[PDB]
């Protein structure tokens, strides 16, 4: 769907900012995003608990699909 296509492009952007890790860290968000937007992401991204998880790992994929994608499923 069009919403999924947009969300995937956002996911791809976060993935680059995360250096191709499957999650992103708060320090990477603060490094790359405007402070208000970094804080929003730090507060609202769900924790990443998949393979390779670490304390503080943030699930940018789930966050992006909820915000821009086909979220009502």
């Amino acid at each position: 769907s069009n919403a999924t296509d947009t969300a995937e492009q956002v996911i791809a952007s976060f993935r680059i900012l995360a250096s191709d890790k499957p999650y992103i860290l708060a320090e990477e968000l603060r490094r790359e995003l405007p402070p208000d937007q970094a804080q929003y992401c730090i507060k609202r991204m769900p924790a990443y608990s998949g393979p390779g998880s670490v304390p503080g790992a943030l699930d940018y994929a789930a966050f992006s699909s909820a915000l821009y994608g086909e979220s009502d499923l």
Binding site: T6, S13, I16, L33, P34
Partner: peptide, 20 residues
């Protein structure tokens, strides 16, 4: 409105600030 404005700004940051 608040969420709509915030997510539009984030979309600009994520898609329209780097040459990705």
């Amino acid at each position: 409105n608040a969420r709509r404005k915030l997510k539009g700004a984030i979309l600009t940051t994520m898609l329209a600030t780097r040459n990705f």
